[PDB]
């Protein structure tokens, strides 16, 4: 749709301000190294010369710590046991995998927590016997709230010597919530307590993994065909190479940029150059993408080696230009879950506009609540709700035959592409703000909003919108491939 030279110029500008802003972030991090070390105790390693890591991130440091401790070995064991079952006798593979999942859950959490998962699953199963979608949703919500209660938190903390084990239990149960809620809703020979235990205690996605729809699990696990061992080895080698590359990139961004430390000390964030501000925003979202690439590629890798078909991994968030697009592609598993359940049952967009505005509102309320329900999560979800609704309304208005005919009459398609990118610039300028509010908390979002739009209304806003305009042109040009079909 565009002359090659124009697209090349847009792409060069896009990579230009990404790398320039990263350079600004790197310089700022270098300048304040001593203060951050004395404040947030930057870690030390020999991975990259004399650089000192910034482990103020919680998910990354936590998951890497565990991966070293136990999870990597247990995943290797799961791989070995899966291959052994497939070779000796595949007829009993599902139950062998279930037993291995129970044993691994016991090893990393002991009986206190395997019992908790079993109790949650059993209660969900019994409630499912009543066969009422409302009952199942209420049971899942109440179980999640119990996970969020205080006395429950204290009793759980009592059992575990190290807090990290308690947080692992919290994440495991937060995801079991979705897994057994999915199964219970589907229930409302295939559906028996043995199958539900097989699904819940599936080790690859036990702790924090892509939400694997029960349909795929039952269909492919019950399958009677598999690839050769040589193909499995080749896939394992390639997947492990890609995972190592992704982990190396995550470590590179952790070392070069102290983005997390800069976001922890709000006073610094409010006195840096605006180029550094945009660089910090982009570095934050890109580090999050790499983190949920590394963490979601290991379960995905294992399930690929088991013959399962996992949800597609997130697509680089430097080519995402919309609330709906990156709600569809970044988190594929959760998106499929939220569409099939949660959204459709309430009514969705097939019954009146109010129906759409309430189905989307309820979906986003549940999504915010699931992540934990803190205040900043509610703000991020409200921002996303407004963005998604506004975008859907604009798309509907454009799709009207009169509007389409007028646009064709007046604006050339080459021109209408420029208008599309111009709108995408604002949409993305709010897409990054919502993500910043989700990551750094309300204060970071307020600092960005004051510094960029209000305090810099004359020219800073225009500069940001122009750079996001080039960004949107590149993003739409790339996304023209997959989005169409």
């Amino acid at each position, epitope marked *: 749709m565009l002359p090659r030279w124009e697209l090349a110029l847009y792409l060069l500008a896009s990579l230009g301000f990404h790398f320039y802003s990263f350079y600004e972030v790197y310089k700022v991090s270098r300048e304040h190294e001593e203060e951050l070390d004395q404040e947030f105790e930057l870690e030390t390693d020999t991975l990259f010369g004399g650089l000192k890591k910034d482990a103020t991130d919680f998910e990354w440091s936590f998951w890497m710590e565990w991966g070293k401790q136990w999870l990597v070995w247990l995943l290797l064991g799961h791989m070995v046991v899966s291959q052994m079952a497939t070779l000796l006798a595949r007829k009993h593979r599902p139950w062998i995998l279930m037993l291995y999942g129970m044993w691994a859950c016991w090893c990393v959490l002991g009986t206190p927590g395997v019992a908790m998962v079993l109790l949650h699953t059993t209660i969900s199963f019994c409630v499912a016997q009543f066969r009422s979608q409302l009952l199942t949703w209420l049971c899942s919500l109440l179980l999640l709230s119990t996970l969020r209660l205080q006395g429950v938190e204290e009793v759980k903390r009592r059992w575990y010597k190290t807090e990290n084990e308690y947080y692992l239990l919290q994440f495991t149960l937060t995801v079991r919530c979705l897994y057994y809620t999915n199964f219970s809703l589907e229930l409302c020979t295939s559906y028996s307590f043995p199958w539900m235990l097989a699904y819940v205690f599936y080790y690859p996605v036990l702790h924090n993994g892509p939400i694997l729809s029960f349909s795929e699990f039952i269909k492919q696990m019950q399958q009677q065909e598999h690839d050769s061992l040589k193909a499995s080895l080749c896939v394992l080698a390639l997947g492990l190479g890609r995972l190592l590359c992704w982990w190396w990139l995550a470590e590179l961004m952790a070392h070069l940029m102290y983005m997390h430390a800069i976001y922890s000390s709000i006073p610094l964030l409010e006195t840096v150059s605006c180029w550094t501000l945009g660089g910090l925003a982009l570095a934050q979202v890109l580090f999050f993408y790499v983190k949920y690439l590394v963490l979601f590629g290991v379960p995905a890798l294992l399930m690929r080696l088991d013959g399962l078909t996992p949800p597609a991994l997130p697509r680089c968030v430097s080519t995402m230009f919309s609330f709906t697009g990156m709600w569809r592609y970044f988190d594929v598993g959760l998106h499929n879950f939220l569409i099939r359940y949660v959204y459709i049952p309430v009514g969705g967009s097939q019954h009146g506009l109010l129906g759409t505005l309430f189905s989307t509102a309820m979906t986003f309320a549940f999504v915010s609540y699931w992540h934990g329900g803190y205040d900043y999560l509610w703000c991020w979800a409200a921002l996303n709700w407004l963005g998604v609704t506004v975008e859907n309304g604009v798309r509907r208005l454009v799709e009207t035959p009169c509007i389409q005919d007028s646009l064709a009459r007046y604006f050339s398609p080459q021109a209408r592409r420029r208008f599309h990118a111009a709108l995408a610039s604002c949409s993305t300028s709010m897409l990054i703000l919502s993500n910043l509010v989700f990551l750094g908390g309300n*204060e970071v979002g307020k600092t960005y909003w004051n510094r960029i739009f209000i305090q810099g209304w004359p020219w800073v806003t225009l500069s940001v919108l122009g750079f996001l305009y080039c960004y949107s042109h590149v993003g739409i040009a790339w996304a023209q491939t997959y989005a169409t079909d």
Partner: nanobody
Amino acid sequence: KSLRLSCTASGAIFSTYDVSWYRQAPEKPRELVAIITRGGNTHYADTVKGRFTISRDNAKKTVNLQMNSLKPEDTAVYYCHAGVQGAMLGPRNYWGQGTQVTVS
């Protein structure tokens, strides 16, 4: 005279916690009194605005609530609460033990 409360975290990176001060009068739910975030931003409950001052010092990892012009209602149990804000920092949340405050 006036009473000065405190909440001194230990073994924690206190530069990021958004400490708070919840008070629970008997036969009533726990209610927010004063919250001080990690950027210095301060917020107060409507009933106790101006009279109450909340301050913090990251150097010593301490918080301090200054209650002035006490009234018979203020008698309650005051709970600290050190919770983070942001998906990078995580789901940290450490309610304090709590302490008793009484007048008349």
